[PDB]
């Protein structure tokens, strides 16, 4: 049996499922970006860019 640290090696000779794994990785990364922005928007105070700029928050 494949050891746990080698499971993804089943893509090496399988370009379509390789593409499908890359697509899934890209999905998760773009989803993170959307979710992170939404969290930031939900928590950001826009009311004082002088003394409470984004980098303090």
């Amino acid at each position: 049996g494949l050891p746990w640290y080698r499971v993804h090696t089943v893509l090496i000779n399988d370009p379509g499922r390789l593409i499908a794994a890359h697509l899934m990785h890209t999905a998760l990364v773009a989803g993170w970006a959307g979710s992170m922005a939404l969290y930031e928007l939900a928590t950001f105070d826009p009311s004082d860019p002088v003394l409470n700029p984004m980098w303090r928050q």
Binding site: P46, S47, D48, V50, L51
Partner: protein
């Protein structure tokens, strides 16, 4: 032209005050030995500005524009009162009655709703 309810209903015009031709730049003389009245006073807001809270440090708060959310429900109209002639010659309007208040809600950036009683009571 004299319009009718059925002409206006649902158009947003019922919330508009009457207007006067571009050529009405005359003058109404005031017979000081005469008593006067306002048969109809109509006010129609077009913009609502709200003073932003100048934070602790402050410097100088501005009046920021706002968005109206309560629709064509904002105008004062059918307001009446006598127009006195003062002894120094000035004129003075004293509201007796009218539709002289409208609750209005505008929204500030960020989404704060500011309700107000737009009014000229008394």
């Amino acid at each position: 032209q004299t319009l009718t309810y059925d002409d206006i209903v649902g158009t947003g015009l019922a919330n508009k005050c009457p207007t006067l031709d571009d050529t009405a730049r005359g003058a109404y003389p005031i017979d000081s030995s005469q008593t006067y009245r306002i048969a109809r006073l109509c006010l129609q807001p077009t913009t609502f500005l709200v003073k932003e809270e100048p934070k602790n440090k402050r410097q100088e708060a501005e009046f920021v524009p706002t968005k109206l959310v309560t629709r064509e429900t904002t105008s004062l109209d059918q307001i009446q009162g006598e127009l006195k002639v003062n002894s120094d010659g000035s004129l003075t309007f004293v509201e007796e009655d009218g539709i002289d208040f409208q609750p209005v809600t505008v929204q500030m950036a960020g989404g704060e709703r500011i309700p107000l009683l737009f009014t000229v009571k008394n």
